[PDB]
Subunit: 256 residues, 5 copies
């Protein structure tokens, strides 16, 4: 039972933060990058290293202690550091003789969610025989059906640096208390197109005028911003991610 | 059928929620969601695709709570492609984009399609090449002539079976389908990027201009889909179609008819 | 003419539903919907395309129930029929790369449709005024170099099928008061077809005064071109490929003076 | 001026319909609508384009019915590029896309621009390379300096002559042009596809935020255009700009002013 | 500060019109609007771009009529000036193919503008934290590996021209309450510039409460980046090319307490 919104000065609050990307971080200098990508010699021997796998980012944000629940009403969000991708001089692969370095480009996934509980995930595997590495949380008891839909693969995005992007998507059969948005753009030559502005707001209310309700006074923010790949001089390629800004406005809602 | 009032009350609404798996060909026990690698005939008349090389339309007939004249009326749809991020696996015996590079991602010709109706989707056959010999186990335009390459009105069918109706020879029949709402996009070209959006905040309203949605004959709801995302290229250069499942959530209400 | 009131009642509306087949050239008895392989002239002066290499505008004149009252075209639903046929990448096509699938239809496309109460009015514009157009086509006559940009002599009516080459003629924007036309040229050898289908989309044909095309002599004119791109066979030769277009038009009776 | 009421009555309105032809260079008696083949200087400093290699802005000054204080106010515009299908001629001395293939279509850098005003379009000069030597017979930014490569406010002109103002060194002056409405898109890149839409159902309203359109000084309407569609590549690989004409229909009404 | 009513009367509005020139590096006396040609470091760790190879943010502080009342920015018209200059494909560029025209400016672009009542607030993000940024630039200091994703130490104001490298800094979304900013990064070596011009488009600068940027000390801050892409020289060497941006801002007097 969702009842009335509380009003008055005390009745609203705001959460602001940045979620850093988790692209694999293969050494102490490579925060925001994955390990260079290697290709298995056969389909059945696919065995990616942990540091080669971008993962979902998640933050649980504590809210002012309050039945009243905080209701998330609006979101401003954008990718932070878009202009860093203009560094075309840091030992990249020249576009042609005497040219500048190739910029970050290729397959991207840009995703964010705001919810009153952890994002609920459904597993789908490109190749069910992929051996996922220690330190990741991946679909278990994979079968050939996992390549299209195996309803056994349910999870909560409840840990950082853990749930690989390629194994998991938001579960559309759940997530009633979350609003999620994502775009996959695939292809090795896809250009990043990244917009920034402090004038754009997304409303998180459903068709009944109710936003995510924050259980235990916690707000869940999740993101992925794989921008593409950086190509080194040698031709090796690494995923590159960037952080995402969130500003969420919340109001006190009475519930029964 | 005269369409009369909508029934109200707690009893008057129901939801259907499900996923339709893709039917891309499934050439062996490890390759669910993929087709056989594509081979090319040497002439038009020798085009003889194997069944497991042909993506087919997916269909589900969903029984609804029995009525009875009341009919369930489909009012809204939420839908999306499930597993979009799986296409980020660029390390599983793909063809390197260049020396030392990552594997080429799934890309190229795609068809994304879905429909919700109160009866089977009605199909019209159109053939790229009327001399194509379609394989046993598929249902395809019969008595094809050269006119079948542009329009032959003999080729009518119902999407009434799974793993049967090849995508490439059938489309929704625009002269029929009064009791279905359908939506599709073909994006052709060997290098087209998949652009796949997901969100739980988007709803499609299924009502026509008179405020009437599909009416479920015999208390059955028909959901149909194709989500050929593109082709996967193996190390050898061979290419296979790759498809993904589609989620449907449909809200229905009871409607009286006479 | 003064346009007056719309008639009402059961008898006052009618509907036209049909398809227009493409006219791409049809170079032999197996290649309906395709053109002849494209050949290139050595010079502008030697450009001499054969008839079966030239896509043409499609047109249908549809008689309406006999009726001063005129039928007024109010709405249109339209789509390209057979879009999924372009997924046949296994039929004598040039491979994308070694061991790869066949190339799909792609490259230059023209998608066009019109609904009018009389024939579509055409204006001729020539890429190359020295092109010798073939017998059996209807093309701009007395062409001069000015025909490459605008020669007002080249006026015609789209009044015959398999006759008016697409590359020679466009809708005349200076006329066509009694037609609604819509078209997009997307040029380039690698452009991807993007073809949408749905039975939920309607185009309203009324102008800014609330008046649709009025059907002179109780004839409705439908015109289309749907050159989807080119098919490349294993030799590398390329042919235009077209598809049919569905039309459903709702009409109502209108009094005029 | 003080803008007062609009006149009404049958003869309070008039229409202008015409077309503007492109001025691409016209290098010989057979090549109207094309430029000369494009060549490239050996140094930045030696850039010296031929007149016939430089597309120019098109302009027409259209006399309106004599009024006298009343002025014609331009209210709406319909406009269209004329001859878009001509670009389907891929069989006329073109460079084949690959062995045995069709000719390459017109593609690459385009500039599509149109304006409607009650006086000549006001131009600001900006030079890619301030040391470019512009040819006799063109009107170009004079006394160019390195600052002309980004902004030199000395370079002001009126679009008041045809075959004169090269496209590449002039743009509409956004600091002026209060009595004109202008619209343009530059799409740059050697493989850019032309995307040209035609319809007689699209109208642009020319009224500003105060409900006032361009007011035609001396009963003259000014129409300006550029429609460089891309480049045509011939068999040798050499490239020429190709332009097309633009149709304009403008509706005007009588406005009292003081 | 409490925001109260807008003042009316003829005296109550003003307008600012200006252009901001690009700061791409200007490697010599002939190359205003271009950067130095781009060179690539031999190792990732040794990235060390020269100052004249780094485009920077442009900023102008514009004094307003001296006035508690404050000038409130309400609307903006803006566009890139000189878009057609990119049609110069004949000035010692690299031919796209044998006998072809020169490659146009293309590839990675950043188009950005802001209007505020105080300096734009910046947050630093580094592609490579071991990049040695050159003397004469203002760049994130005490860089660590966290600087490659988010190091909140890297805060700055866009308070100087020719100083803040584009690749190091973005608008700080956690600040800028009194600024409206808009930007698009389009990355990739072959992306085509798509540049629209028109004098008919207005951006409204009011927030959801109907309040625009309020100009502290009667100064308006305008900021811009218009890196259009790269020019490729005949040798293959590449230089960033930028263009100026026009701003017209309408302001009104607002009483505050
Ligand atoms: C951004 C960056 O750090 N780029 C460098 C990359 C990068 O650190 C790794 O690829 C991340 O996984 O490393 C480059 O050098 C590597 C390792 O130092 C290569 O020379 C590879 O070294 C190996 O030892 C290895 O397995 O990592 C052997 C392998 O054969 C080498 N690979 C190649 C393609 O030569 C790199 O080029 O990948 C340097 C780059 O600046
Ligand atoms: C628009 C323009 O001015 N283009 C010229 C460029 C340009 O001035 C610089 O690249 C700006 O940084 O210079 C070109 O010639 C240069 C020198 O003027 C080259 O020959 C390079 O000269 C060097 O002395 C240098 O380091 O700058 C040595 C270097 O090896 C040379 N680089 C190459 C690739 O040959 C140029 O091509 O870059 C001429 C161009 O018109
Ligand atoms: C995803 C997958 O299984 N790929 C494998 C394919 C397919 O099994 C068949 O082509 C299906 O027809 O077969 C290969 O021999 C090949 O063609 O190079 C090896 C490749 O690793
Ligand atoms: K007319
Ligand atoms: K001005």
């Amino acid at each position: 039972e969702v009842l009335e919104v509380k009003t008055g000065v005390d009745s609203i609050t705001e959460v602001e933060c940045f979620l850093t990307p988790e692209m694999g971080d293969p050494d102490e200098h490579l925060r925001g990058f994955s390990k260079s990508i290697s290709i298995s010699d056969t389909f059945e021997s696919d065995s990616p290293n942990r540091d080669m796998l971008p993962c979902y980012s998640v933050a649980r944000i504590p809210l002012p202690n309050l039945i009243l629940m905080w209701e998330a009403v609006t979101l401003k969000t954008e990718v932070i550091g878009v202009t860093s991708l203009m560094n075309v001089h840091s030992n990249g692969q020249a576009t042609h003789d005497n040219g500048a370095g190739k910029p970050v480009q290729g397959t991207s996934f840009h995703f964010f969610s705001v919810g009153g509980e952890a994002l609920e995930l459904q597993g789908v595997l490109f190749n069910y025989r992929t051996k996922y590495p220690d330190g990741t949380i991946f679909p278990k008891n994979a079968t050939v059906q996992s390549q299209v839909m195996n309803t056994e693969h349910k999870a909560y995005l409840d840990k950082n640096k853990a749930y690989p992007v390629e194994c998991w998507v938001p579960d559309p059969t759940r997530n009633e208390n979350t609003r999620y948005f994502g775009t996959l753009t695939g292809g090795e030559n896809v250009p990043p197109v990244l917009h920034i502005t402090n004038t754009a707001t997304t409303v998180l209310l459903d068709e009944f005028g109710v936003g995510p309700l924050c259980k235990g006074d916690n707000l869940y923010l999740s993101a992925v911003d794989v921008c593409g790949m950086f190509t080194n001089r040698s031709g090796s390629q690494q995923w590159r991610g960037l952080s995402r800004y969130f500003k969420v406005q919340l109001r006190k809602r009475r519930v029964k």
